């Protein structure tokens, strides 16, 4: 959403547009913020190492859980 | 032999202190287990049993003492109650489920957070050191008395 | 106009009178909550940070930050109550304030303060006189002596071994009973062992070696023992003893009223108002116990006329019971002293109608 | 009455959870505007005055004075994400603010915080699975190495000499492969000649 | 949170991008009247009291006490435009 | 016209008890989130930038600057509990809190504190003496020893490998058993690797 | 078990108020009566009732204190069901 | 929901939301019954996809159970019309973005 957003394309519309083409096309089916529409990212020369991804989900997810547990924040003064 | 140097290794120095702190205590309680081969039952089962016993006592005992002993028992049912909350399970449904299944399943009916239901502690593998609960009933209880006795917090200036 | 520099308050008549009645009656109701076996301890926390949890009043009024002049006096009654007989340090404080709660009313009748002293003093004497009548005169009677030492060591951090401490206190006093003197019986605690290892170093001199766990636990055993050495010394110096629990206060309170009738003039209302105050003590007992002070009192009074003034209030059985039989006795000098300090003290209050408050 | 120390904060379950979500989400939507090849820079002029116009989320959060704890958590994600991968440092934060956004709804509904924390974790296990399950498995091979070094040097100023910086980045690592440790790859920026003269000293 | 304590700038949303426009506007219109053979000179008198009557937009933006960052951008344009060709500094 | 100075404390009768109980209970309910298995730690931060994420109640009650006297009484309990055994430190604290809450409830129903105590002293002993004749003397039985161990390792960060350490604690003690002398079991905390690498 | 418990429990405790109030309007403490009555009721069977004129629990059949079934039956059946409906309402339009 | 996926466009999120609004009726049942609406739908949606939609929410036994067996049937026109009426009205209001009412 942010991608199409910081590109001028309608976030909500661009997304659902991708969601469908992602089921018809392939996993590579992404959003080319330089064509104004969906396209095969694998052919657009845009790939990132699986690590960055894997980490991303884990890093932020655990945190969300680390502060979601804190039922109190009292530390005198 | 007659010594064992346990070398701990954790991710960060923060998890190292905890891992070492936890071990020290984990070893302390075991010292209690090697000085007493007795084990009660968790899952609030122990307390749930007391909560019922004391109650039966707070009945055939006239005078305001019945009220106190009654509040004492109810105060114990909090162990399992909280154990459910912290788990995500509704305490109300647990307090009743555990309490009734306790007068029918003996001191072997405790709470299972992982299953969100009451089960058997002796068959599940949930056994605690007697020394632990022993203190609790002696430390906490009597302690409340002092703070309860003190009806005046005076001071110089 | 400013006839005096604004640095010395000055109340007028009922202005000061009333200020003292409340004040001295206030600090009084403070100790009443800690009177009896089921006494509610207090937590004194000075400006340093040292928490002081005690029951005795002298130990509470000593840590208590007191600027009020009238309150200072109440601190000298309990203090002097602990330096003489020791036990019942709170009583004098509670009794004193009680004599105020009664005096005030009389003052409302227009009864001049000074005159109020009449009844209070005339009744007090006869009150102490009625004690010499209902007092028990025991005999080197090792039996009665040790029995009293145990009653002064009961309900304290030395009640677990009050039997040994009683023996040590009785021998220490008997060896210097040349006519005894509490100046030839030194004490000395020491960490190590238990409270059962306490011995008596020998004997116009006796060194009491007290052993105990922590340093605090020992301090209470030494404190219970100190009062034990005073009580035993009181009876040995005065073969007079009575029964606590309240029975005594009930007997006097009854006698006073009666005598108040035989005596006309305003001194009548005073004496009566004096006796009624002799009930605040027994009433307080049933209070700090858990029973209704009103129901108990009257229950004890009816049973006090049917079984002589030997029956009091059993704060452990919840109801009337004979103190004598229950082995609940106290030295005579104690009660004879209690009434004095408290009363005499009070006499000063009424005699003060000014005050020059500092800051 | 007087159970808490003079001047002290005591947020309760329902009270605390709210603040945290807010602080975070607020910080997220802050750098969520610099993400992408068209991101927007943010002039970070601290107290002294030394401005720090950066587009990277990490650099932004590391230059920003952060008073509330909960939002500092995000600053930790950016730092970690920038040391565990480098790029996508702005993503970890944004997503974090989102995960918190949707869960709140559940909270204000009647779902115990714990259950949620357990669920999300379960989805994480599934997420990582699928993603990795469809990732194109590459090969040592110096070819694929110059691919992650070339397409990673573009869009920047080094793109002018990425064809040379890539090979060096491949030889710099190919040697430190004792897992690769970035501490064995000493970098030194000197002033002389041009970026086309650069050399990788073994 | 309390990110940037007292004495701290930071404009977001429309509140800023707008401020930038008006920022570039007021500045623009200023030297806007100094272009052409009939240029309307200005008298820049800084703090020290030094009077400087000029016609060049660059010299005006370099002696103009500017506070907003965006407006300073125009002063940079007048700089790049002055060190490359000169005139037309106001046009840019 | 003032017994105490314009800066002396002395709550009396109820006022003090009411204020005391609340002070303790409040603290008891605080650490009441890390009771038994599974909990929610507290990232404590003094005033000198000393962030500390702990699950143990004792550690929490000691890093917090308590000013309420009655509360300090709880820290003592948490301290005493942690000194003798270790775990359950959160139980004893919370329990005391509730007890006091129930107490003040009876006081409002006009019931002398001492009368309540007497009743509490009757049931308390009744509860203990009961656990003794209601428990079961299992066995040096490693099976049960691992159950007690696994139940003490959980509710923490080590819960992920509680099993691995459960065998390390039951083996380190079983070997030095007979006198339970922990002063012999030395621990070496080494930063690096995972918790599953630890050895005995 | 189930919430049904606490309910049935709170129902019984709500039935103890009858004698409780019977002791209050007597000047006799109720807190002590409830305990005295409840405890002495588990020993003296159903023949244990409060005796205001004596300020203590006494035998109901020995004192000739007997009510008519219809009375109590109606009450229990009445209030109960009635209240149920009152608890089924959670939005009423009365007057300002 | 599944048909919302088989058909992209912004109408996709719409259909999804519509479906979510079709879970309220059941969720409400569990609500008014006393059982946790969420935990209930947990067993419902599950026991439903497994044993066909012939299973619903038994507010009497607190949980899931086959409705066809509990004899809890209802004419098709009931539900049928229900969706309609509600849909048509709500739609109208949605088209209402301004109402000038004098007096």
């Amino acid at each position: 959403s942010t991608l199409a957003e910081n590109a001028g394309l309608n976030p909500i519309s661009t997304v659902t547009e991708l969601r469908n083409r992602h089921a018809q096309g392939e996993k590579t089916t992404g959003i080319n913020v330089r064509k104004g529409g969906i396209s095969n990212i694998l052919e657009e020369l845009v790939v990132q190492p699986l690590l960055v991804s894997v980490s991303a989900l884990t890093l932020a997810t655990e945190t969300v859980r680390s502060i979601l547990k804190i039922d109190d924040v009292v530390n005198t003064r | 032999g007659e010594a064992c140097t346990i070398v701990l290794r954790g991710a960060t120095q923060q998890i190292l202190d905890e891992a070492e702190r936890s071990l020290h205590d984990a070893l302390c309680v075991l010292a209690q287990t090697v000085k007493d081969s007795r084990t009660v039952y968790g899952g609030g089962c122990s307390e749930m049993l007391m909560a019922h016993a004391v109650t039966q006592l707070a009945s055939r005992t006239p005078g305001k003492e019945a009220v106190a002993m009654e509040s004492y028992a109810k105060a114990l049912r909090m162990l399992p109650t909280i154990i459910a909350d912290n788990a995500g399970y509704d305490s109300a449904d647990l307090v009743a489920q555990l309490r009734a299944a306790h007068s029918e399943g003996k001191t072997t009916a405790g709470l299972d957070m992982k299953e969100g239901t009451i089960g058997d502690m002796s068959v599940l593998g949930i056994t605690e050191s007697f020394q632990v609960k022993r203190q609790v009933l002696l430390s906490a209880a009597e302690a409340a008395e002092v703070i309860l006795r003190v009806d005046n917090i005076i001071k110089a200036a | 106009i400013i006839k005096d520099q604004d640095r010395k308050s000055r109340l007028m008549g009922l202005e000061a009178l009333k200020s003292h009645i409340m004040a001295a009656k206030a600090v009084a109701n403070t100790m009443k909550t800690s009177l009896g076996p089921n006494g509610l301890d207090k937590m004194m926390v000075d400006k340093d940070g040292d928490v002081t949890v005690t029951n005795d009043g002298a130990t509470i009024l000593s840590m208590m930050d007191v600027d009020h002049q009238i309150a200072k006096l109440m601190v000298e009654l309990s203090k002097s109550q602990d330096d003489e007989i020791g036990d019942g340090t709170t009583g004098v404080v509670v009794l004193a304030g009680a004599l105020l709660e009664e005096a005030e009313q009389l003052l409302d009748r227009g009864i001049h303060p000074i005159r109020i002293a009449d009844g209070y003093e005339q009744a007090a004497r006869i009150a102490i006189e009625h004690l010499d009548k209902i007092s028990d005169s025991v005999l080197k009677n090792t039996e009665p002596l040790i029995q009293t030492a145990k009653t002064t060591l009961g309900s304290k951090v030395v009640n677990s071994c009050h039997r040994q401490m009683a023996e040590i206190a009785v021998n220490a006093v008997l060896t210097v009973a040349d006519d005894v003197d509490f100046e030839l019986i030194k004490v000395e605690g020491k960490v190590g062992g238990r409270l059962e290892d306490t011995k008596l170093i020998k004997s116009r001199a006796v060194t009491i070696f007290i052993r105990g766990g922590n340093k605090m636990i020992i301090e209470e055993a030494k404190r219970s023992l100190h009062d034990a050495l005073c009580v035993i010394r009181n009876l040995i110096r005065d073969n007079r003893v009575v029964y606590g629990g309240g029975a005594a206060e009930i007997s006097c309170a009854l006698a006073v009223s009666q005598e108040a009738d035989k005596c006309p003039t305003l001194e009548q209302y005073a004496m009566r108002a004096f006796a009624d105050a002799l009930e605040v003590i027994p009433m307080a007992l049933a209070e700090n116990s858990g029973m209704n002070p009103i129901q108990t009192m009257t229950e004890v009074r009816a049973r006090q006329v049917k079984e002589n003034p030997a029956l009091g209030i059993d704060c452990l059985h919840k109801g009337t019971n004979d103190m004598k039989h229950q082995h609940v006795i106290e030295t005579l000098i104690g009660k004879k002293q209690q009434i004095s300090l408290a009363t005499q003290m009070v006499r000063m209050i009424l005699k003060i109608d000014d005050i020059r408050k500092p800051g | 009455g007087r159970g808490k120390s003079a001047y002290q904060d005591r947020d309760k379950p329902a009270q605390i959870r709210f603040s945290n979500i807010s602080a975070a989400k607020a910080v997220a939507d802050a750098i969520r505007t610099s993400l992408g090849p068209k991101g927007m820079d943010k002039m970070i002029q601290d107290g002294k005055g030394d401005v720090t116009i950066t587009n990277d989320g990490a650099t932004i959060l590391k230059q920003m004075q952060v008073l509330h704890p909960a939002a500092r958590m995000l600053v930790e994600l950016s730092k970690a994400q920038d040391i565990e991968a480098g790029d996508g440092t702005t993503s970890v934060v944004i997503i974090a603010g989102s995960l918190l956004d949707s869960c709140t709804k559940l909270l204000q509904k009647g779902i115990h915080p714990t259950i949620i924390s357990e669920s999300f974790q379960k989805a994480l296990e599934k997420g990582i699975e699928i993603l990795t399950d469809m990732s194109r498995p590459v090969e040592s091979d110096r070819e694929t190495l110059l691919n992650s070094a070339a397409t990673s040097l573009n869009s920047k100023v080094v793109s002018q000499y990425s064809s040379l910086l890539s090979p060096m980045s491949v030889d710099a690592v190919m040697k430190v492969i004792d897992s690769v440790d970035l501490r064995d790859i000493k970098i030194v920026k000197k002033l002389g000649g041009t970026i086309d003269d650069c050399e990788l000293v073994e | 949170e309390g990110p940037l304590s007292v004495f701290g700038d930071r404009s977001t949303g429309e509140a800023i991008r707008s401020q930038n426009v008006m920022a570039a506007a007021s500045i623009a219109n200023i030297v806007k009247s100094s272009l052409g053979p009939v240029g309307l000179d200005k008298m820049l008198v800084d703090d020290i009291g030094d009077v400087t009557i000029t016609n060049d937009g660059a010299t005006i933006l370099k002696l103009l006490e500017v506070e907003h960052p965006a407006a300073k951008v125009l002063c940079e344009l007048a700089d790049l435009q002055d060190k490359e060709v000169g005139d037309g500094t106001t046009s840019v | 016209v003032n017994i105490f100075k314009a800066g002396a404390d002395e709550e009396r009768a109820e006022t003090a008890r009411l204020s005391s109980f609340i002070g303790a209970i409040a603290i008891g309910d605080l650490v009441k989130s890390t009771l038994g298995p599974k909990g929610m730690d507290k990232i404590l931060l003094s005033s000198d930038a000393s962030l500390m994420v702990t699950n143990d109640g004792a550690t929490i009650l000691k890093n917090i600057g308590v000013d309420n006297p009655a509360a300090k009484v709880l820290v003592d309990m948490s301290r005493v509990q942690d000194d003798e055994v270790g775990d359950g430190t959160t139980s004893v604290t919370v329990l005391a809190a509730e007890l006091l809450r129930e107490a003040e409830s009876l006081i409002a129903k006009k019931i002398h504190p001492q009368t309540i105590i007497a009743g509490w002293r009757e049931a308390t002993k009744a509860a203990r003496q009961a656990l003794l004749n209601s428990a079961v003397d299992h066995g040096k039985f490693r099976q049960d020893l691992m159950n007690i161990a696994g139940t003490t390792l959980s509710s923490k960060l080590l819960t992920h490998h509680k099993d691995h350490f459960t065998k390390l604690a039951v083996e380190a003690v079983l070997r030095l058993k007979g006198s339970g002398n922990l002063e012999a079991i030395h621990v070496i905390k080494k930063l690096g690797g995972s918790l599953a690498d630890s050895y005995l």
Side-chain angles (χ1 to χ4, degrees), chain A, chain B, chain C, chain D, chain E, chain F:
Chain A
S1 37
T2 60
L3 293 184
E5 182 184 69
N6 296 290
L9 297 188
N10 185 298
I12 305 175
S13 265
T14 308
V15 172
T16 176
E17 182 194 330
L18 172 64
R19 174 189 292 295
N20 182 54
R21 287 295 309 199
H22 190 69
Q24 311 178 292
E26 289 171 311
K27 178 199 71 170
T28 61
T29 303
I31 303 180
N32 183 281
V33 288
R34 307 171 150 199
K35 264 213 173 88
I38 42 77
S39 50
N40 190 277
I41 303 289
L42 199 66
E43 306 181 314
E44 311 306 302
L45 293 168
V46 184
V47 293
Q48 304 291 52
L50 188 61
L51 204 154
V52 193
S53 334
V54 174
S55 147
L57 298 219
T58 327
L59 273 170
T61 195
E62 300 296 304
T63 298
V64 178
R65 181 182 196 187
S66 266
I67 27 68
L68 191 153
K69 294 183 175 159
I70 309 305
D71 58 285
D72 175 289
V73 181
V74 199
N75 306 320
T76 179
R77 190 172 261 64
Chain B
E2 56 214 26
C4 55
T5 306
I6 302 170
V7 184
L8 293 175
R9 313 94 77 86
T12 52
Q13 192 57 50
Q14 162 71 73
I15 304 162
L16 191 65
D17 306 314
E18 165 72 324
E20 193 179 55
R21 152 82 205 311
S22 169
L23 233 318
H24 172 67
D25 292 298
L27 283 168
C28 290
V29 270
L30 284 170
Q32 309 276 306
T33 64
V34 299
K35 295 182 190 288
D36 163 55
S37 50
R38 194 159 314 184
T39 180
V40 299
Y41 280 152
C45 198
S46 183
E47 297 296 56
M48 189 45 105
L49 181 58
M50 305 296 91
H52 192 37
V54 176
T55 296
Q56 304 179 283
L57 322 177
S59 50
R60 27 152 110 173
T61 302
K64 325 112 89 79
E65 302 214 299
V67 199
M69 287 183 101
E70 177 56 64
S71 63
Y72 181 68
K74 304 182 171 170
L76 304 187
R77 291 183 309 180
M78 288 319 279
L79 180 63
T81 300
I82 302 305
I83 290 182
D85 309 304
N86 301 18
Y89 181 54
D90 227 331
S91 58
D93 309 320
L94 181 285
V95 182
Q97 179 184 58
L98 171 71
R99 190 166 181 76
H102 188 72
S103 339
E104 176 190 71
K106 277 178 187 172
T107 320
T108 58
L111 164 56
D112 190 313
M113 298 171 78
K114 291 184 158 170
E115 316 295 307
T117 172
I118 177 178
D120 190 293
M121 309 294 94
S122 72
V123 187
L124 268 170
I126 300 298
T127 59
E128 339 171 67
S129 150
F130 161 74
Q131 283 286 307
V132 187
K133 294 296 287 262
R134 186 189 42 66
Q135 156 112 57
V136 182
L137 285 192
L138 175 68
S139 212
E142 326 307 70
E145 305 188 31
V146 196
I147 330 172
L148 157 57
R149 275 223 279 272
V150 188
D151 80 283
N152 187 340
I153 300 174
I154 325 77
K155 119 133 126 242
Chain C
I1 199 157
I2 293 167
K3 51 171 68 187
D4 292 58
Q5 216 131 261
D6 244 65
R7 238 220 173 284
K8 252 162 256 64
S9 296
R10 180 223 221 163
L11 302 144
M12 283 184 64
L14 184 46
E15 211 187 311
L17 296 168
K18 180 179 160 190
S19 82
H20 292 184
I21 314 163
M22 280 273 241
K25 174 186 176 186
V27 53
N29 292 300
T30 315
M31 282 61 259
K32 181 172 76 199
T33 49
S34 55
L35 182 46
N38 15 245
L40 318 183
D41 63 51
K42 268 63 191 172
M43 185 168 71
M44 323 287 307
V45 186
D46 47 58
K47 74 145 201 299
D48 296 294
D50 302 294
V51 175
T52 289
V53 195
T54 179
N55 300 308
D56 199 53
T59 311
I60 298 168
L61 298 176
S62 44
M63 278 278 192
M64 166 167 312
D65 187 299
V66 177
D67 276 28
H68 206 323
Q69 288 179 293
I70 192 49
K72 291 181 173 171
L73 298 174
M74 299 294 267
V75 179
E76 282 142 305
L77 297 179
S78 68
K79 186 60 179 50
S80 300
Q81 179 78 114
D82 171 53
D83 298 304
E84 307 302 305
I85 44 82
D87 61 66
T89 299
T90 305
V92 64
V93 186
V94 174
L95 174 65
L99 313 176
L100 293 182
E101 130 237 15
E102 300 303 300
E104 48 197 80
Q105 297 152 308
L106 300 180
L107 290 169
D108 286 301
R109 312 170 169 183
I111 305 292
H112 215 300
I114 334 177
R115 167 63 53 179
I116 292 173
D118 286 277
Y120 277 48
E121 221 40 62
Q122 297 171 311
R125 305 174 209 180
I126 313 174
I128 299 181
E129 178 177 60
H130 192 18
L131 295 163
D132 301 302
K133 169 200 131 47
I134 72 172
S135 179
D136 179 75
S137 288
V138 293
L139 180 47
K140 308 162 161 88
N141 44 300
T142 309
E143 181 55 55
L145 288 181
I146 299 171
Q147 286 184 317
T148 322
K150 300 176 172 195
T151 57
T152 308
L153 294 170
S155 311
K156 303 174 185 179
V157 187
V158 75
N159 89 314
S160 54
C161 213
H162 58 313
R163 188 190 48 70
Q164 165 68 54
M165 287 299 254
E167 179 79 72
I168 289 179
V170 179
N171 288 309
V173 181
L174 174 56
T175 31
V176 287
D178 311 287
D179 327 288
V180 198
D181 186 55
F182 61 94
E183 192 199 286
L184 295 169
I185 305 174
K186 178 218 180 166
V187 196
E188 178 59 65
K190 183 58 61 181
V191 63
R194 288 274 186 164
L195 286 178
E196 299 169 292
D197 296 299
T198 49
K199 64 179 167 185
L200 179 55
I201 306 303
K202 304 291 190 176
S203 281
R204 278 184 75 163
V206 274
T207 306
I208 297 179
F209 170 56
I210 302 172
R211 300 195 208 174
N214 293 295
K215 259 103 300 300
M216 225 50 240
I217 280 96
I218 299 177
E219 290 172 278
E220 189 50 57
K222 172 193 167 178
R223 191 139 205 303
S224 313
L225 177 68
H226 184 49
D227 291 294
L229 292 169
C230 293
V231 292
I232 296 183
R233 185 180 52 67
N234 291 309
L235 174 61
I236 189 161
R237 248 179 193 178
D238 190 21
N239 67 322
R240 311 281 194 59
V241 63
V242 289
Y243 316 125
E249 304 60 84
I250 306 303
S251 178
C252 314
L254 159 55
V256 183
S257 303
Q258 300 177 296
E259 295 284 306
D261 305 296
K262 312 179 188 186
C263 298
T265 55
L266 307 175
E267 306 186 316
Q268 188 159 56
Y269 294 174
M271 292 182 103
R272 306 166 152 196
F274 172 82
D276 291 301
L278 306 175
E279 305 179 69
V280 305
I281 302 308
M283 176 281 270
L285 287 172
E287 162 180 85
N288 301 294
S289 56
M291 310 302 99
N292 179 294
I294 303 167
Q295 281 186 296
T296 304
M297 171 60 73
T298 187
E299 175 185 316
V300 184
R301 184 171 288 298
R303 295 286 303 179
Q304 191 268 294
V305 198
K306 171 182 167 169
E307 290 188 291
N308 317 333
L311 182 160
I313 304 179
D314 196 316
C315 275
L316 298 186
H317 289 54
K318 311 304 191 184
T320 60
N321 211 285
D322 198 315
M323 295 306 94
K324 175 272 180 188
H325 189 58
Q326 288 291 289
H327 299 296
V328 186
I329 60 181
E330 323 170 58
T331 56
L332 177 282
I333 293 310
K335 299 294 175 185
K336 194 154 79 80
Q337 156 84 141
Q338 198 162 333
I339 304 157
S340 192
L341 271 157
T343 289
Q344 317 324 306
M345 178 270 168
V346 175
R347 180 168 54 76
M348 308 180 63
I349 296 58
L350 322 182
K351 288 181 183 281
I352 315 147
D353 67 271
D354 204 62
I355 306 312
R356 283 279 157 167
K357 223 168 291 174
Chain D
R2 288 306 288 201
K4 317 254 91 294
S5 181
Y7 304 80
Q8 176 190 292
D9 321 283
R10 182 191 88 182
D11 297 309
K12 296 232 58 184
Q15 309 179 300
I16 182 54
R17 294 154 196 294
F18 165 50
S19 69
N20 304 324
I21 306 311
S22 325
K25 174 157 294 291
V27 180
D29 302 302
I31 53 174
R32 187 198 53 177
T33 65
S34 76
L35 171 64
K38 307 261 193 190
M40 296 176 290
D41 74 69
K42 317 298 191 166
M43 203 224 58
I44 299 182
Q45 198 179 302
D46 60 71
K48 195 171 192 285
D50 312 297
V51 157
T52 302
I53 296 183
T54 183
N55 306 33
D56 186 62
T59 298
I60 295 166
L61 304 170
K62 288 175 183 174
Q63 301 292 312
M64 287 351 288
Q65 159 73 82
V66 181
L67 215 148
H68 189 302
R72 286 185 186 173
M73 310 286 276
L74 299 179
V75 188
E76 306 181 294
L77 298 185
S78 62
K79 185 188 176 183
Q81 177 55 55
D82 186 45
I83 302 180
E84 302 173 308
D87 317 301
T89 297
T90 313
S91 313
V92 58
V93 189
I94 301 177
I95 308 173
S98 180
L99 302 181
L100 290 170
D101 172 59
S102 207
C103 66
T104 56
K105 318 176 177 173
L106 311 182
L107 296 170
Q108 277 126 296
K109 289 174 178 180
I111 310 188
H112 184 310
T114 291
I115 304 179
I116 307 179
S117 310
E118 264 208 320
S119 312
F120 277 50
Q121 182 66 55
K122 194 175 296 174
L124 196 285
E125 249 175 287
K126 173 55 168 160
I128 286 180
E129 189 186 63
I130 324 148
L131 283 186
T132 67
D133 252 295
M134 299 327 158
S135 90
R136 180 162 189 69
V138 291
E139 190 173 304
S140 32
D141 180 52
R142 208 220 198 191
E143 187 198 63
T144 43
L145 291 182
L146 306 177
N147 278 317
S148 180
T151 58
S152 166
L153 287 172
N154 308 314
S155 328
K156 310 174 187 179
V157 195
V158 302
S159 60
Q160 252 62 56
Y161 293 124
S162 59
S163 179
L164 172 65
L165 302 185
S166 308
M168 289 184 281
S169 304
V170 171
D171 285 309
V173 177
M174 189 173 83
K175 291 180 205 198
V176 298
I177 52 168
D178 291 75
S179 316
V180 179
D181 188 51
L182 283 173
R183 216 59 49 63
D184 277 306
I185 309 171
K186 160 199 182 193
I187 298 177
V188 194
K189 49 150 280 56
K190 180 86 282 177
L191 333 184
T194 38
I195 298 193
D196 185 54
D197 305 307
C198 274
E199 70 178 33
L200 172 64
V201 179
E202 171 183 302
Chain E
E1 192 145 286
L4 321 152
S5 14
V6 201
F7 328 123
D9 263 291
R10 172 196 140 225
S11 34
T12 168
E14 188 59 48
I16 171 58
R17 253 174 324 203
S18 314
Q19 284 179 300
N20 300 290
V21 190
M22 312 180 85
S26 311
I27 299 296
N29 306 299
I30 290 167
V31 305
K32 173 179 299 183
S33 60
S34 18
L35 186 36
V38 287
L40 319 186
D41 48 65
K42 307 173 171 58
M43 183 180 86
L44 307 143
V45 183
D46 41 60
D47 298 296
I48 19 175
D50 184 287
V51 178
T52 309
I53 318 177
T54 179
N55 293 292
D56 185 62
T59 300
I60 294 171
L61 293 179
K62 304 179 191 182
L63 290 181
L64 175 61
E65 312 164 50
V66 178
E67 208 103 338
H68 189 308
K72 299 195 181 174
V73 184
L74 297 183
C75 290
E76 281 156 340
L77 309 176
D79 181 60
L80 329 186
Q81 191 67 47
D82 176 48
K83 307 185 168 189
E84 296 310 317
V85 283
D87 240 296
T89 304
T90 288
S91 292
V92 60
Chain F
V1 300
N2 66 305
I3 308 172
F4 296 69
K5 266 177 183 188
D9 345 322
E10 189 213 50
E11 306 169 300
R12 222 197 290 164
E14 177 55 23
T15 296
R17 285 209 297 299
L18 170 67
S19 41
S20 179
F21 307 141
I22 301 172
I25 305 172
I27 306 296
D29 297 310
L30 160 72
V31 305
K32 186 175 68 178
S33 58
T34 69
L35 170 49
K38 297 177 192 177
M40 310 297 224
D41 40 74
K42 300 169 178 60
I43 296 177
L44 310 171
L45 282 77
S46 169
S47 282
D48 286 297
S50 167
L51 192 155
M52 174 121 92
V53 198
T54 169
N55 294 292
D56 184 59
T59 286
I60 303 162
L61 294 180
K62 286 165 194 180
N63 289 305
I64 302 169
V66 186
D67 291 17
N68 190 303
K72 299 178 183 185
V73 176
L74 299 179
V75 180
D76 289 293
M77 299 170 81
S78 75
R79 177 179 59 73
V80 170
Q81 183 65 100
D82 175 55
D83 286 307
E84 314 307 10
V85 287
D87 163 61
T89 296
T90 304
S91 310
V92 54
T93 302
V94 177
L95 284 171
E98 186 55 48
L99 301 180
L100 303 178
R101 213 163 59 61
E102 295 279 338
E104 58 183 310
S105 309
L106 279 60
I107 304 169
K109 308 177 201 193
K110 274 206 262 176
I111 302 173
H112 187 304
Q114 204 61 68
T115 307
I116 301 175
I117 304 181
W120 284 10
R121 190 190 301 305
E122 297 162 65
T124 294
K125 309 197 191 167
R128 283 196 309 270
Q129 317 283 56
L131 303 179
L132 286 155
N133 305 309
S134 64
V136 176
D137 312 304
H138 45 300
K140 293 184 191 181
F141 210 50
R142 193 158 181 288
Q143 179 62 57
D144 292 301
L145 300 171
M146 294 182 118
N147 298 307
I148 316 278
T151 47
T152 294
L153 300 181
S154 48
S155 93
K156 303 169 193 314
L157 183 61
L158 310 314
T159 311
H160 189 54
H161 281 301
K162 53 163 100 189
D163 304 289
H164 175 61
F165 292 61
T166 288
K167 314 179 191 189
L168 295 178
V170 179
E171 190 184 49
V173 182
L174 160 67
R175 187 192 303 88
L176 295 64
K177 139 202 69 171
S179 186
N181 208 127
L182 297 173
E183 303 170 289
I185 304 176
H186 191 191
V187 180
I188 294 309
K189 58 170 197 73
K190 280 283 80 185
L191 169 159
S194 89
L195 324 148
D197 292 302
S198 302
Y199 59 70
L200 193 161

